[PDB]
């Protein structure tokens, strides 16, 4: 079955803490292989070898070169090129893509995981012609990737797309009233995007205005059954989001945003989005066409392969 082959073949591995996911890709974006192995625990020669051995399977598998990207829960310092990362000790420092292309013997891209899934998102047969994609996770944080006629745009530092690290802006800050608490971020600052829109968050400000942990799912059970303090929440929120898309989608003004995680999976989110966010819109502006995340389960390996489609 492998000879009925495309002139091109894209490889993507998702290098997790315990799992290292490899996947082929046609040129038409379809899957014609799977295979995970353990992610070497602390041992980076090991680390190095397990990926090259991949590579050299496949390449023999298909008679043929593919082309090498990867992704993982961390990123390249841009200056340096050494690996930032806490998920993959194995890698923290060490020149990942340099250390790799020397035993390979040909180039290889790589990428956070995070924009991996939004580039994912942005393949998708309905998204292809979308001039700009913003892919956002929400669950246990608030971010993404920011792709531009199908390509991952880094920044400078390699840190476009970190929207949870922006602040609340103001008119979020009012919305959240006298009793709007100001959370800690796990980046150093106070008041991150990051603290209250994830699913994180969205637990995090019932406990502060109902004194009591309650976990998203339960949450969104009550409102749906219709429990008082659920259902003020659930406005809350609303609300709270729309505005801070509001002020994203002033500067950024993308054409289509696709969500991803835990949250994503709360349906009224994309009922509400376009009734709340033109509010907060310039007068001439319209929101975008806001889904949920298509292909989410295996983002980081299609988003990793998707990084060398000649563009
Ligand atoms: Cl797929
Ligand atoms: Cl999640
Ligand atoms: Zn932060």
Same mark, same amino acid.
């Given at each position: 079955n492998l000879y009925f082959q495309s002139n091109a073949?894209?490889?993507?591995? @998702?290098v997790g +803490?315990? /799992?290292?996911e490899f996947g082929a890709f046609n040129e038409k974006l379809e899957r014609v292989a799977t295979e995970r192995v353990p992610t !070497?625990? @602390? @041992?980076?020669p090991l680390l190095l070898e397990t990926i090259a051995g991949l590579v050299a399977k496949y390449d023999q598998e298909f008679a043929c070169? +593919? /082309?090498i990207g990867l992704?993982? !829960?961390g990123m390249e310092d841009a200056d340096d090129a050494t690996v930032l990362t806490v998920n993959v000790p194995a890698a923290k420092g060490k020149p990942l893509r340099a250390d790799l292309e020397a035993k390979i013997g040909r180039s290889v891209k790589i990428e956070n995981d995070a924009n991996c899934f939004?580039?994912?998102?942005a393949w998708d047969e309905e998204l292809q012609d979308a001039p700009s994609v913003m892919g956002l996770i929400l669950g246990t944080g608030f971010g993404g990737g920011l792709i531009y006629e199908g390509k991952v745009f880094s920044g400078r530092n390699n840190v476009a797309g970190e929207l949870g690290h922006m602040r609340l802006p103001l008119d979020a800050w009012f919305h959240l009233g006298d009793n709007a608490p100001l959370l800690g971020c796990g980046c150093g600052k106070k008041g991150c995007l990051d603290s209250y829109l994830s699913g994180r968050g969205f637990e995090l400000l019932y406990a502060h205005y109902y004194g009591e942990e309650k976990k998203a799912i339960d949450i969104i059970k009550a409102n749906? $059954?219709?429990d008082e303090k659920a259902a003020e929440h659930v406005e809350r929120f609303m609300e709270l989001l729309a505005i801070c898309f509001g002020n994203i989608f002033t500067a950024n003004d993308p054409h289509v945003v696709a969500l991803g995680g835990g949250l994503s999976n709360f349906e009224l989110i994309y009922e509400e989005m376009p009734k709340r966010v033109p509010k907060y819109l310039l007068s001439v $502006? /319209?929101?975008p066409k806001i889904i949920k995340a298509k292909h989410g389960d295996s983002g980081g390996v299609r988003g990793a392969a998707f990084l060398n489609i000649k563009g």
């Open positions: 073949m894209y490889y993507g591995f @998702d +803490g315990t /799992k290292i !070497p625990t @602390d @041992d980076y070169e +593919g /082309k992704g993982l !829960p939004a580039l994912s998102e749906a $059954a219709g $502006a /319209k929101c």
